[PDB]
Ligand binder design. Structure first.
Ligand SMILES: Nc1ncnc2c1ncn2[C@@H]1O[C@H](COP(=O)(O)OP(=O)(O)O)[C@@H](O)[C@H]1O
Ligand SMILES: [Mg+2]
Ligand SMILES: [Mg+2]
Ligand SMILES: [Zn+2]
Length: 251
């Protein structure tokens, strides 16, 4: 039959969240799992507005000043339109997850999308793209728990061979140039204030990346700070794409 959700889209250029609704139908069992999450095949039963589901309240997160009152322009209306097959992700059985973490995870994926666009403006041999991600509140479910409402993230379905190219702790898992050159690009151009790793997906369409920052603050559970940054440095070998972008040989 399906279930309702409040759907949240972040737009970095206006620095605001857009609040929508959708109906979806999720398979009972996951098709894949990672270190932290389980992934479920899902179908869209349509995207709509949030008009029927008022915010009310204060404790509100995101805070009201961070939400656009207008939602007419969005990615969800196209990318999650009625009939679309996509992916829903839940944290495995959890304790360290707050409401804020889900939004932080989605914002992080959006920040990576901006880095992808920045990398592409340099005219690399292979352009890259990160998938959209959204927060969904599964408002038809009881809170179970703990009493906490049920949240998840959703993303488009990748079709093809899913491959991890690097991890968030120094592993270089494939021999391809582009994913490693991009990680290096983000480190140099950010004045070493961040790096994008966990570059994974189908060809150069990536998802669930991870950012480290020197102070380790923000960017979710997987931000391993200076330690994560140094691990990347220890195993990074510059390649033909690094050289084309004129990246520093010393990190
Ligand atoms: N958008 C997607 N489309 C298809 N399969 C996916 C997608 N995202 C993740 N997967 C699969 O689900 C697994 C778990 O996803 P996730 O926890 O996000 O990544 P990780 O592999 O870093 O743990 C992945 O290893 C991959 O096999
Ligand atoms: Mg991540
Ligand atoms: Mg953190
Ligand atoms: Zn390099």
């Amino acid at each position: 039959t399906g279930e309702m959700g409040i759907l949240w889209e972040f737009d970095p250029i206006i620095n605001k969240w857009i609040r929508l609704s959708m109906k979806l139908k999720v398979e009972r069992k996951p098709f894949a799992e990672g270190a932290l999450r389980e992934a479920y095949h899902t179908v869209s039963l349509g995207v709509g507005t949030d008009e029927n589901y008022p915010l009310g309240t204060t404790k509100l997160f995101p805070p009201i000043e961070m939400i656009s009152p207008i939602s007419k322009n969005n990615e969800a209306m196209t990318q999650l339109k009625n009939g679309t097959k996509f992916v829903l992700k839940l944290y495995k059985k959890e304790q360290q997850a707050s409401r804020e973490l889900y939004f932080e995870d989605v914002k992080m994926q959006m920040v990576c999308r901006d880095w992808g666009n920045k990398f592409n403006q340099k005219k690399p041999p292979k352009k890259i793209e990160f998938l959209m991600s959204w927060v969904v509140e599964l408002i038809d479910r009881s809170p179970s728990s703990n009493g906490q409402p049920i949240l998840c993230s959703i993303e488009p379905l990748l079709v093809g061979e899913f491959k991890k190219n690097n991890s968030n702790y120094g592993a270089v898992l494939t021999n391809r140039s582009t994913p490693q050159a991009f990680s290096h690009f983000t480190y140099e151009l950010s004045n070493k204030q961040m790096i994008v790793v966990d570059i994974q997906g189908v060809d150069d369409l990536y998802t669930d990346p991870q950012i480290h920052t020197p102070d380790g603050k923000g960017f979710g559970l997987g931000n391993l700070g200076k330690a994560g940054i140094n691990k990347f440095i220890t195993t990074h070998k510059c390649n033909a794409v690094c050289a084309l972008l004129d990246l520093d040989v010393k990190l």
